[PDB]
Design a protein around this motif. Structure first.
Motif, PDB file in Angstrom:
ATOM      1  N   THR A  20     -24.123  57.157  21.768  1.00 37.39           N
ATOM      2  CA  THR A  20     -24.138  58.621  21.478  1.00 37.39           C
ATOM      3  C   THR A  20     -25.541  59.162  21.055  1.00 37.39           C
ATOM      4  OG1 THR A  20     -23.385  60.212  19.786  1.00 37.39           O
ATOM      5  CG2 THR A  20     -22.749  57.881  19.432  1.00 37.39           C
ATOM      6  N   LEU A  21     -26.109  58.601  19.971  1.00 42.09           N
ATOM      7  CA  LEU A  21     -27.492  58.885  19.517  1.00 42.09           C
ATOM      8  C   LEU A  21     -28.570  58.386  20.463  1.00 42.09           C
ATOM      9  CD1 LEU A  21     -28.104  58.312  15.767  1.00 42.09           C
ATOM     10  CD2 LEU A  21     -27.255  60.354  16.932  1.00 42.09           C
ATOM     11  N   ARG A  22     -29.522  59.238  20.828  1.00 42.58           N
ATOM     12  CA  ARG A  22     -30.515  58.874  21.866  1.00 42.58           C
ATOM     13  C   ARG A  22     -31.989  59.203  21.499  1.00 42.58           C
ATOM     14  NH1 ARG A  22     -32.023  61.950  26.481  1.00 42.58           N
ATOM     15  NH2 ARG A  22     -30.241  63.250  25.856  1.00 42.58           N
ATOM     16  N   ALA A  23     -32.202  59.833  20.355  1.00 43.77           N
ATOM     17  CA  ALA A  23     -33.526  60.266  19.980  1.00 43.77           C
ATOM     18  C   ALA A  23     -33.686  60.211  18.471  1.00 43.77           C
ATOM     19  CB  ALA A  23     -33.781  61.671  20.506  1.00 43.77           C
ATOM     20  N   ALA A  24     -34.873  59.840  18.008  1.00 45.14           N
ATOM     21  CA  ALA A  24     -35.166  59.824  16.556  1.00 45.14           C
ATOM     22  C   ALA A  24     -36.404  60.655  16.257  1.00 45.14           C
ATOM     23  CB  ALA A  24     -35.338  58.401  16.045  1.00 45.14           C
ATOM     24  N   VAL A  25     -36.327  61.479  15.217  1.00 40.58           N
ATOM     25  CA  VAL A  25     -37.403  62.414  14.903  1.00 40.58           C
ATOM     26  C   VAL A  25     -37.826  62.102  13.492  1.00 40.58           C
ATOM     27  CG1 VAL A  25     -38.181  64.817  14.912  1.00 40.58           C
ATOM     28  CG2 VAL A  25     -36.234  64.180  16.308  1.00 40.58           C
ATOM     29  N   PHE A  26     -39.129  61.997  13.302  1.00 39.73           N
ATOM     30  CA  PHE A  26     -39.700  61.566  12.060  1.00 39.73           C
ATOM     31  C   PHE A  26     -40.672  62.605  11.608  1.00 39.73           C
ATOM     32  CE2 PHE A  26     -38.447  57.068  12.045  1.00 39.73           C
ATOM     33  CZ  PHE A  26     -37.947  56.953  13.330  1.00 39.73           C
ATOM     34  N   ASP A  27     -40.766  62.785  10.307  1.00 44.34           N
ATOM     35  CA  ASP A  27     -41.826  63.586   9.740  1.00 44.34           C
ATOM     36  C   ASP A  27     -43.014  62.666   9.416  1.00 44.34           C
ATOM     37  OD1 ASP A  27     -43.085  65.828   8.623  1.00 44.34           O
ATOM     38  OD2 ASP A  27     -41.871  65.689   6.790  1.00 44.34           O
ATOM     39  N   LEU A  28     -44.186  63.243   9.214  1.00 44.33           N
ATOM     40  CA  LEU A  28     -45.361  62.450   8.845  1.00 44.33           C
ATOM     41  C   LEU A  28     -45.484  62.307   7.323  1.00 44.33           C
ATOM     42  CD1 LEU A  28     -48.597  61.537   9.936  1.00 44.33           C
ATOM     43  CD2 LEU A  28     -48.890  63.742   8.832  1.00 44.33           C
ATOM     44  N   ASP A  29     -45.713  63.426   6.640  1.00 43.68           N
ATOM     45  CA  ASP A  29     -45.812  63.387   5.185  1.00 43.68           C
ATOM     46  C   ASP A  29     -44.472  62.919   4.573  1.00 43.68           C
ATOM     47  OD1 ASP A  29     -47.835  63.644   3.211  1.00 43.68           O
ATOM     48  OD2 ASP A  29     -46.848  65.442   2.402  1.00 43.68           O
ATOM     49  N   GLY A  30     -44.529  61.769   3.902  1.00 43.61           N
ATOM     50  CA  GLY A  30     -43.393  61.240   3.165  1.00 43.61           C
ATOM     51  C   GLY A  30     -42.409  60.433   3.999  1.00 43.61           C
ATOM     52  N   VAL A  31     -42.656  60.290   5.298  1.00 41.36           N
ATOM     53  CA  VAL A  31     -41.751  59.500   6.119  1.00 41.36           C
ATOM     54  C   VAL A  31     -42.554  58.469   6.917  1.00 41.36           C
ATOM     55  CG1 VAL A  31     -39.882  59.593   7.875  1.00 41.36           C
ATOM     56  CG2 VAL A  31     -40.099  61.430   6.167  1.00 41.36           C
ATOM     57  N   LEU A  32     -43.502  58.910   7.746  1.00 41.01           N
ATOM     58  CA  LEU A  32     -44.393  57.949   8.476  1.00 41.01           C
ATOM     59  C   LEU A  32     -45.720  57.637   7.755  1.00 41.01           C
ATOM     60  CD1 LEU A  32     -43.914  58.955  12.321  1.00 41.01           C
ATOM     61  CD2 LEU A  32     -43.287  56.763  11.324  1.00 41.01           C
ATOM     62  N   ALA A  33     -46.137  58.510   6.851  1.00 37.32           N
ATOM     63  CA  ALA A  33     -47.307  58.254   6.047  1.00 37.32           C
ATOM     64  C   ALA A  33     -46.944  58.518   4.591  1.00 37.32           C
ATOM     65  CB  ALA A  33     -48.458  59.138   6.473  1.00 37.32           C
ATOM     66  N   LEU A  34     -47.325  57.565   3.731  1.00 35.30           N
ATOM     67  CA  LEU A  34     -47.158  57.609   2.281  1.00 35.30           C
ATOM     68  C   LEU A  34     -48.508  57.295   1.629  1.00 35.30           C
ATOM     69  CD1 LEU A  34     -43.918  55.454   1.788  1.00 35.30           C
ATOM     70  CD2 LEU A  34     -44.097  57.943   1.480  1.00 35.30           C
ATOM     71  N   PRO A  35     -48.725  57.726   0.354  1.00 36.09           N
ATOM     72  CA  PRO A  35     -47.937  58.700  -0.412  1.00 36.09           C
ATOM     73  C   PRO A  35     -48.023  60.076   0.235  1.00 36.09           C
ATOM     74  CG  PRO A  35     -50.042  58.299  -1.480  1.00 36.09           C
ATOM     75  CD  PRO A  35     -49.878  57.236  -0.430  1.00 36.09           C
ATOM     76  N   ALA A  36     -46.965  60.883   0.124  1.00 35.81           N
ATOM     77  CA  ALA A  36     -47.008  62.297   0.571  1.00 35.81           C
ATOM     78  C   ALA A  36     -48.090  63.082  -0.179  1.00 35.81           C
ATOM     79  CB  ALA A  36     -45.639  62.971   0.407  1.00 35.81           C
ATOM     80  N   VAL A  37     -48.669  64.135   0.411  1.00 30.03           N
ATOM     81  CA  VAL A  37     -49.674  64.938  -0.330  1.00 30.03           C
ATOM     82  C   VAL A  37     -49.070  65.832  -1.432  1.00 30.03           C
ATOM     83  CG1 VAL A  37     -51.147  64.881   1.742  1.00 30.03           C
ATOM     84  CG2 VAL A  37     -50.059  67.065   1.021  1.00 30.03           C
ATOM     85  N   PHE A  38     -47.899  66.418  -1.160  1.00 27.62           N
ATOM     86  CA  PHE A  38     -47.132  67.191  -2.155  1.00 27.62           C
ATOM     87  C   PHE A  38     -46.967  66.387  -3.453  1.00 27.62           C
ATOM     88  CE2 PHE A  38     -44.834  70.673   0.365  1.00 27.62           C
ATOM     89  CZ  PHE A  38     -45.589  70.506   1.525  1.00 27.62           C
ATOM     90  N   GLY A  39     -47.045  65.060  -3.312  1.00 25.40           N
ATOM     91  CA  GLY A  39     -46.848  64.110  -4.397  1.00 25.40           C
ATOM     92  C   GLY A  39     -48.100  64.004  -5.234  1.00 25.40           C
ATOM     93  N   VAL A  40     -49.249  64.200  -4.598  1.00 24.78           N
ATOM     94  CA  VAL A  40     -50.516  64.248  -5.322  1.00 24.78           C
ATOM     95  C   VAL A  40     -50.646  65.590  -6.048  1.00 24.78           C
ATOM     96  CG1 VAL A  40     -53.047  63.989  -5.182  1.00 24.78           C
ATOM     97  CG2 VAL A  40     -51.546  62.532  -3.763  1.00 24.78           C
ATOM     98  N   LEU A  41     -49.870  66.580  -5.631  1.00 26.47           N
ATOM     99  CA  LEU A  41     -49.713  67.779  -6.457  1.00 26.47           C
ATOM    100  C   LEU A  41     -49.048  67.455  -7.805  1.00 26.47           C
ATOM    101  CD1 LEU A  41     -49.133  71.005  -4.396  1.00 26.47           C
ATOM    102  CD2 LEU A  41     -51.196  69.684  -4.857  1.00 26.47           C
ATOM    103  N   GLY A  42     -48.015  66.605  -7.786  1.00 24.61           N
ATOM    104  CA  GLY A  42     -47.383  66.108  -9.013  1.00 24.61           C
ATOM    105  C   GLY A  42     -48.280  65.237  -9.883  1.00 24.61           C
ATOM    106  N   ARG A  43     -48.880  64.204  -9.290  1.00 25.17           N
ATOM    107  CA  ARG A  43     -49.681  63.257 -10.064  1.00 25.17           C
ATOM    108  C   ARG A  43     -50.893  63.915 -10.737  1.00 25.17           C
ATOM    109  NH1 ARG A  43     -49.543  60.837  -6.506  1.00 25.17           N
ATOM    110  NH2 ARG A  43     -47.509  59.783  -6.483  1.00 25.17           N
ATOM    111  N   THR A  44     -51.631  64.707  -9.971  1.00 25.79           N
ATOM    112  CA  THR A  44     -52.690  65.531 -10.530  1.00 25.79           C
ATOM    113  C   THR A  44     -52.183  66.259 -11.790  1.00 25.79           C
ATOM    114  OG1 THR A  44     -53.785  65.841  -8.390  1.00 25.79           O
ATOM    115  CG2 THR A  44     -54.285  67.419 -10.107  1.00 25.79           C
TER     116      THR A  44
END
Ligand SMILES: CC(C)(C)OC(=O)N[C@H]1CNc2ccccc2C1
Ligand SMILES: CC(C)(C)OC(=O)N[C@H]1CNc2ccccc2C1
Ligand SMILES: [Mg+2]
Ligand SMILES: [Mg+2]
Lengths: 546, 546
Positions: free
Chosen positions: A1-25
C-alpha cells in the motif's frame, strides 16, 4: 500500500535542528525562555521568517530583521540583550553544527532500495552568508540519495500551508495514503494527516525508525552495515583527453580539491572504483578515475609497444599537461599499481603522493631476465600464457559474461586455479560455462564490464603483459633511486597471486612507506572490501596528501 | 636556412639561474669564492651532480652528497661552514626564486609562430623535495610553448656530452646548420658549434635576442605586445554531463583550484573564452568553459521552454551536482551574463562569486510586460525579429561563414546596424555576401564556429530569446532580494547594444558590486580586448573569490 517516504531536513535528516540552537542559546545566555523562538516567529504568516522561507528575501537580508524582532521582544519582556548579541554568530554556529543523521539517511536509502519514491521536503532559505558553502555541501551529500528535493524557498510555499502538500502529492505522483511523511514539528504533520498520509512525529531517531519499520513492514533499524555509495555510469561526468594523435584517454570525474587519479588493473575499468569515487569526493578530493590505455572508452591501438611502462607513463604525464594539472595523487591496483610506482620513480614532480593496492614495488633484477624471474614462480604461470598474441585474446573474448563472472570472485568463491595454466591450455579449462554470481557483484554490474569489453576486447589489455624485456631495461635506469615522496601500500590477506609477503622488502626502496592491510580480502580489493579501502585511503590522503 | 631554435631553461628561459645562487650565497655568507661551485662539480663526469643530472639519483638523495662535498671543500680550503649551513634551504630558495624570462619565451613564441621548430634542452634533475610542485608548475607553463622538451634526467645524457646534441639533432629532424642553440654556459655551446650550429652565448637577455634577431632575420625585440595564449580545441580536455534524459552539457576544462564556470553569449561557444582559458588556469583556477544548452556539443532540444531562465538555471545546478561541486564562480557574457545574475539570485549557495561582461543586472518591471519594455528601445528591435520561430533561423543558417564574419567585428569595423531590423526584413539585408575578416579573428577561428553550428544551427540558441514572458514571471519572484555575494560587472565602452549606462543603477540591487571598464571595446569583449579582460578577472578572483 505505502510507496513513498518524505523526510524533512531540520530535525529529521540533519541534527541538531537549528530551532534547537534557539533554545540552547537562550539557556546558554540565561535569556527569557522562548524569547528567541518568539523573535523567530514574529508576525507569523506575514513576518520576516515566512518571507525568508518563501524565497522572498535572502538569509543575509533576514538577519537584521530578526535582530529587530529580538530587540522588540527583549523590550516587551523588559530584559536587556547581552553586549555582543549576534544573530549572525548564533546562526553561523548552529548551521555548521548540524550533520547528516546517519541512521535516518540509511533508512531512507534502504526504502529507496526496496522500491519507494523518496523525497526531502523542507522549509529553507536562500543562503548568501560568507559561510554558505557549508550548507551547499550538506545539501549535495543528501540530495543525491532522494528522488526529489522540494525547498520552501524554491517553490514559494511553506509547511504547514496546505498547498505545499498538494505540490508534494503532485511531485510524487502518488495519493496521500501511499505516503509516509516524517517531521519533528507536529504542526507540519497536521496537514499531512488531514489528507490521510501516515505521519511520524520524529523525536528520537530510533523510535521514529521503529514506527517507520512497523508501518512499511521493512527492516530499517539494526540492519547490516550497507555498502558505500556506488556510481551510476550515466550520472557521471565523462572526460576525454587526446594525449597524442592515435590515442585518447577517458575518465570519470567527481569532487573538488587535490586531484586524485585512480588507475584500475587487468582486466578492469574506471568502474572498478565505483565504491571509492563518491567517498573520496565526499572526503574533499577531485577524483579522476581512468580507463587506462587499451580499455573501455580509451583508445586501444593494436601495437604491443604502445603498452610498455615508459609509453604508458609519458602518456599519463601528458594527461596532466593537457588537463592543466601540475601534480596528482596516483592510486593504483594491480597493473595500475605497477604504473604508479613507476610514475613516482620517473616523474616525482608530478606525483603528489603514491599508493598501491596489492601490487608491491619490486625493482628489476639487473642480473636476471624478467621472463626467467617469472618461470621461477609457479603462481605467475598465467603471465606466460599471455605472451602469444591471439591465444588469451581468443579464450577471454569467447564469452564475456563467463570471463568476468569467473574472474571477479571473493577469496572463498574461486573457480580457476592459476596453477599450470599453460599446461591446462587455458584459464577456464577447468571452470564452468555458467558460473554463479559472486556475492561481490550484481548481474547488472557484470554486464557493464561485458559491454565495455565489446569495444576493444583484450588485445590492448593483454599487451600490458607483453613488454617484459622492454620494461626491464627501462626499470634498470631507476635502480639507483629511492621513492621519498609520500607512499602507501595496501596488502590483501587473501590475494593468492599478489601476496602480502611479496611486499616485505619495500621499505629498502621506500624508507618512509606507510601500510594498510585488509583481512579476508582476495584480489579484487575495491569491490571485495569497499568500506575498509575507503577508510584506509581517506585516512592516508588526509594525513599525507593535503 | 635556419629552421629550429633550442633554448636552455636555467639562465635562458628562466632567471635567475640556480648556479647563480651558488655565487650569491657565497658572497651573502662571506665564504671562499667558488667554494659552492667547487662542491657542486666535484668528481666531474663521475661526481654526484652528474649522476643527478643523468637521472641516476633523485634530488633528495643528492642533497646529502653535496653536503659531503661542501664539508670536504671547506676542509681543504681550511674554513668552517656556518652554523646552520643548509643545502636544502639554499636550493628550495634558489628554485622558487627562478621565474620565466618573459622576453625569451616571447621570442621563442614568435619564432615558433613564423615556422620554427622550437625546443627546451636542459640539464635537470628528478625533483622529489616536499616543494617540488613549484618546478612542476614552471615546467608546465613553459613546455606547452615548445615542440620538444628534452631533459637530461629523462634521457640519461647531459650537456656538454656530444651525444645529447646528436639526440637533439635527431629529435628535431634537422641538420646542425638549420639550428640556433642558446645557452648561458660556454662549455655547452662548444659541441653545438663543433657540429656547425649557430650558437648564442646568453649573458643579458636583450643582447642575446639581438644576435637571435640578426641571425634569423625575424623581429623579436621591441615587437608589439602579443595576444594571450589561445586554446587548441583538440588539445583540450572535453567533458560531458547528462543533466536529465534528453539533455547533456559539454564543457572544456583546464587547471586546478577554485572551480570557475564560464558562460558564453549568443550566438557563440566555449571557444569564445579561448583567451581566458589558459590565463585563469595559469592564475590558479579550475576553468570550466561551457557549451551552453543549445550550442556546439551540448544538446539542443527543439522546444522553446527548454530554454527559459529557470530551466537553464536548474540545469546548471544539476551540472554542479553531478560533477560533485558545491559552488563555482560564475562568469558570463551577454546571454550567459544574464544567466549568472539569475544564478546568484536563486542559487547563491552554489555561486562562490558572480561576474558579467557587458550584461547589466536589470530587474523585471512588475508593471510592464517585457515585450513592451523591449519596444520602448530602438536598439533592441532585433529581439523582436527573433520571436517568430523560423524567420531568424533561416537567415542565420543560410550562410554560416557569412553570419559569423558579419557578427564578430571590432567597434570600428561594423557592417550591420541593429536599426529597425524588423522593417529591413533581416539582420544582414544591408551587409556583404563576402565580408572581410575582422582583425579580431583568423580564418581558422571563423571555421571553428561554422563547424559547431552545423550540428544544431540556431533554433536552440534563438529560443533563449523566446521566453520573454516566462522569464518575467519568474524574475518577479526575486524582486525582494538583493545580490550580496561577491559580484563584478564589466562594461565595454563601445558595445552599442549593451551600453555602459545600462549598468548604472546596479548598485541598488548589489550594494557591494565591483566594476571594471574596458575602453575601445565593442560587444565581443573576450576576443576584442583579451589582455584587459584577463587582467580584470584575475585581479577580482584573487581578491574576492579565494
Ligand atoms: C601485472 C601484475 C604482476 C601486477 O599482476 C597481475 O597479473 N594481475 C592480475 C590481473 N587479474 C588477473 C586475471 C587473470 C589471471 C591473472 C590475473 C592477475
Ligand atoms: C540577451 C541580451 C539582452 C543580454 O543581449 C543580446 O541580445 N546579446 C547580443 C547577442 N549578439 C547579437 C547578435 C546579433 C544581434 C544582436 C545581438 C545582441
Ligand atoms: Mg523541522
Ligand atoms: Mg645553464
Amino acid at each position: 500500500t505505502l510507496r513513498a517516504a518524505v523526510f524533512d531536513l531540520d530535525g529529521v535528516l540533519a541534527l541538531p535542528a537549528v530551532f534547537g540552537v534557539l533554545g540552547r542559546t537562550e539557556e546558554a545566555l540565561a535569556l527569557p525562555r522562548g524569547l528567541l523562538n518568539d523573535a523567530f516567529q514574529k508576525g507569523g504568516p506575514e513576518g520576516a521568517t515566512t518571507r525568508l522561507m518563501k524565497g522572498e528575501i535572502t538569509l543575509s537580508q533576514w538577519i537584521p530583521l530578526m535582530e529587530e524582532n529580538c530587540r522588540k521582544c527583549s523590550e516587551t519582556a523588559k530584559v536587556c540583550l547581552p553586549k555582543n548579541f549576534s544573530i549572525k554568530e548564533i546562526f553561523d554556529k548552529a548551521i555548521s553544527a548540524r550533520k547528516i543523521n546517519r541512521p535516518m539517511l540509511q533508512a531512507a536509502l534502504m526504502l529507496r532500495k526496496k522500491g519507494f519514491t523518496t523525497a526531502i521536503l523542507t522549509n529553507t532559505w536562500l543562503d548568501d552568508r560568507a559561510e554558505r558553502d557549508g550548507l551547499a555541501q550538506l545539501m549535495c551529500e543528501l540530495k543525491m540519495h532522494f528522488d526529489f528535493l522540494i525547498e520552501s524557498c524554491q517553490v514559494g510555499m511553506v509547511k504547514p500551508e496546505p498547498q505545499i502538500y498538494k505540490f508534494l502529492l503532485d511531485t510524487l505522483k502518488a495519493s496521500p495514503s501511499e505516503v509516509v511523511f516524517l517531521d519533528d514539528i507536529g504542526a507540519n504533520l497536521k496537514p499531512a494527516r488531514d489528507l490521510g498520509m501516515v505521519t511520524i512525529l520524529v523525536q528520537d531517531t530510533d523510535t521514529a525508525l521503529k514506527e517507520l519499520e512497523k508501518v512499511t513492514g521493512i527492516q530499517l533499524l539494526n540492519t547490516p552495515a550497507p555498502l558505500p555509495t556506488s556510481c551510476n555510469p550515466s550520472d557521471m561526468s565523462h572526460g576525454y583527453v587526446t594525449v597524442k594523435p592515435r590515442v585518447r584517454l577517458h575518465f570519470v570525474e567527481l569532487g573538488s580539491g587535490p586531484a586524485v587519479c585512480l588507475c584500475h588493473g587487468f582486466p578492469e575499468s574506471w568502474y572498478s572504483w565505483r565504491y571509492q569515487i563518491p567517498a573520496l569526493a565526499q572526503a574533499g578530493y577531485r577524483v579522476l578515475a581512468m580507463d587506462m590505455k587499451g580499455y573501455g572508452e580509451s583508445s586501444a591501438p593494436p601495437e604491443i609497444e604502445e603498452y610498455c611502462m615508459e609509453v604508458l607513463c609519458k602518456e599519463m604525464v601528458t594527461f596532466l599537461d593537457k588537463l592543466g594539472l601540475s601534480q596528482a595523487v596516483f592510486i593504483g591496483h594491480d597493473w595500475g599499481g605497477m604504473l604508479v610506482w613507476y610514475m613516482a620513480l620517473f616523474y616525482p614532480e608530478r606525483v603528489r603522493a603514491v599508493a598501491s593496492l596489492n601490487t608491491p614495488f619490486i625493482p628489476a633484477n639487473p642480473n636476471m631476465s624478467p621472463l626467467e624471474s617469472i618461470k621461477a614462480n609457479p603462481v605467475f604461470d598465467y603471465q606466460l600464457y599471455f605472451q602469444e598474441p591471439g591465444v588469451a585474446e581468443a579464450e577471454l573474448e569467447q564469452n564475456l559474461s563467463r570471463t568476468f563472472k569467473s574472474l571477479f570472485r571473493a577469496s572463498d568463491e574461486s573457480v580457476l586455479s592459476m596453477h599450470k595454466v599453460c599446461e591446462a591450455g587455458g584459464l577456464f579449462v577447468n571452470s564452468p560455462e555458467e558460473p554463479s554470481l559472486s556475492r561481490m557483484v550484481t548481474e547488472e554490474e557484470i554486464q557493464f564490464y561485458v559491454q565495455q569489453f565489446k569495444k576493444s576486447g583484450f588485445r590492448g589489455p593483454l599487451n600490458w603483459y607483453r613488454n617484459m624485456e622492454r620494461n626491464w631495461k627501462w626499470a634498470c635506469k631507476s635502480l639507483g633511486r629511492k621513492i621519498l615522496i609520500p607512499a602507501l601500500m595496501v596488502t590483501a590477506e587473501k590475494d593468492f597471486v599478489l601476496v602480502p609477503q611479496m611486499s616485505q622488502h619495500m621499505e629498502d626502496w621506500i624508507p618512509h612507506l606507510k601500510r594498510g592491510h585488509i583481512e579476508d580480502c582476495g584480489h579484487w580489493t575495491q569491490m571485495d572490501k569497499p568500506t575498509e579501502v575507503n577508510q584506509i585511503l581517506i585516512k592516508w590522503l588526509d594525513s599525507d596528501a593535503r
